[PDB]
Amino acid sequence: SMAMKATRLAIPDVILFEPRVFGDDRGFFFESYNQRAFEEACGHPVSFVQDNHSRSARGVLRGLHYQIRQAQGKLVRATLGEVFDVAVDLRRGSPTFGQWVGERLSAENKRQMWIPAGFAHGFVVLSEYAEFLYKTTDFWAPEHERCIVWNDPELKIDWPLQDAPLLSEKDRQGKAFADADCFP
Amino acid sequence: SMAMKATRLAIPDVILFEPRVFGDDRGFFFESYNQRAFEEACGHPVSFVQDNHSRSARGVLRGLHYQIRQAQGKLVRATLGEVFDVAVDLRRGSPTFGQWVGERLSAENKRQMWIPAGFAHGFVVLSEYAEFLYKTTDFWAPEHERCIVWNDPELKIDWPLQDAPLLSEKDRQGKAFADADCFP
Numbered sequence A, B: 001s002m003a004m005k006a007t008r009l010a011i012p013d014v015i016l017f018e019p020r021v022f023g024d025d026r027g028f029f030f031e032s033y034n035q036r037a038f039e040e041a042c043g044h045p046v047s048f049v050q051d052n053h054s055r056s057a058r059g060v061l062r063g064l065h066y067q068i069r070q071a072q073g074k075l076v077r078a079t080l081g082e083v084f085d086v087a088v089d090l091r092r093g094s095p096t097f098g099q100w101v102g103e104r105l106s107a108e109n110k111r112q113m114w115i116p117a118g119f120a121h122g123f124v125v126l127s128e129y130a131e132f133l134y135k136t137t138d139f140w141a142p143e144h145e146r147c148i149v150w151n152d153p154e155l156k157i158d159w160p161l162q163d164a165p166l167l168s169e170k171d172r173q174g175k176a177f178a179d180a181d182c183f184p
C-alpha cells in the first residue's frame, strides 16, 4: 500500500511525516492527510477543528507560541517555499522539558510535523517567501495565548538565520523561558 | 467578529465561501477552515477524514467524479492559479436533478465550494498551472469510483475552455449521464 512514512523525533511525541507523490502527464496527486494513518502513527484519536494559512517574507520569524488553556495540537506543512520549524517541550514533568526539535519543511520535500498539546511552536522563513498551513485540535483563544522569546538563552535554539528576524511586536516582547507559564 | 461570508448557490445545498485575509508587515494570515462557522452555515455536523492535494497544467480537466458508496462530501479551494469548479446534482429525487453550478476559484480570491454527498465534481485549469486542495468526509475507495464524461450533451456544462482538455484515460472513457449510476 501507498501512504506516509512516519518518524519519531528526538522528543518521541514529535513526529515527522513524508508523503508519496504520484506523477502522471496531467501533473501530480498526493494525500496530504489520512486519519487512518495519522491515528495509527499517533496511537490515539484526534479531531481537527480549524485550519490556518499564512504567508511570510524571508527572515520573518513567528513564535514561540502556545495556548495555556484550549491548548492546540498542531499538524503543520509548507506549500510555498522553505521554513525551519521548531517544537519546544514545555511539559514540566516530561524528561525532555526545556528541549526542542527542528526540521526543514518545504513545498518541495512536502514533509510535515505533528506537535502535541504541551509544546511551544515557531518557524523562520529561509526562501524569498513561504506559505505555511496547519490544522489544530482547538479554536483560537487570544486570552489564553502565551509567547516565549525566540532567542532565549536557556533554550539555545540553533536557528539557521543570517540577518536579524522580522517579528510582530508581541513576539519581540516574548517572555523569558524562566518566567513563562508552562504545562504540567 | 471576523469569519467567512457564505452564499448558497443556485442549487441551495452547494455553498460558496469567502474568507477574510488579515495583512501586516510580515505578510498575511487567514482561517482556511473553522468548524463552528462551517457547521453553522451547513446546518449539520461534519467530520473530514482525508485531505488531498493535486497540481495540473493549463487545460487539464479532472472529472466528473463521485463514489456511489462511501460517498464523499467535499470542501475545495485553489492555493496556486485559477480553476472553474463544477458540481452536478446526481440525486434522482432532488428537484434540481441533472442541474449543475460552477464558480471560478483562485489563489487570489481564496473562495471555496462545499459539495455534499450526492453530487459529481470536476474542474478545469485556466492558468499556466493550478494547485487544488480539498477535504473529504470519507476515504478513497477505487471499487466505488464512478465517472460521467465532461462534455455530456444532456448536462451541457458551459466550460470556459479554449482548446481541447487533457484528460486521464478513465475520464476520456466516462459514462454518458443517461447510462450513469445515480443517487436516490
Ligand SMILES: Cc1cn([C@H]2C[C@H](O)[C@@H](COP(=O)(O)OP(=O)(O)O[C@H]3O[C@@H](C)[C@H](O)[C@@H](O)[C@H]3O)O2)c(=O)[nH]c1=O
Pocket (backbone or CB within 6 Å): A052, A054, A062, A063, A065, A066, A074, A121, A122, A123, A140, A168, B002, B022, B029, B030, B031
Ligand atoms: C492565530 C490566529 C490569528 N488570527 C488573526 C489575528 C491577527 O489579526 C492575525 C495574525 O495573528 P498572529 O497571532 O500575529 O498570527 P501568528 O501567525 O503570529 O500566530 C500563529 O503562529 C504560529 C507559529 C503558531 O503555531 C500559531 O498557534 C499562532 O500562534 O490573524 C485569526 O483570525 N485566527 C487565528 O487562529
Ligand SMILES: Cc1cn([C@H]2C[C@H](O)[C@@H](COP(=O)(O)OP(=O)(O)O[C@H]3O[C@@H](C)[C@H](O)[C@@H](O)[C@H]3O)O2)c(=O)[nH]c1=O
Pocket (backbone or CB within 6 Å): A002, A022, A029, A030, A031, B052, B054, B062, B063, B065, B066, B074, B121, B122, B123, B140, B168
Ligand atoms: C483520489 C485518490 C487518488 N489517489 C492516487 C491514485 C492515482 O495513482 C493518483 C491519481 O488518481 P486519480 O483518480 O487519477 O486522481 P483525480 O485527481 O483524477 O481524482 C480526483 O478528482 C477530483 C476532481 C474529485 O473530486 C476527487 O474525488 C477524485 O476523483 O492518485 C490516492 O492515493 N488517493 C485518492 O484519494
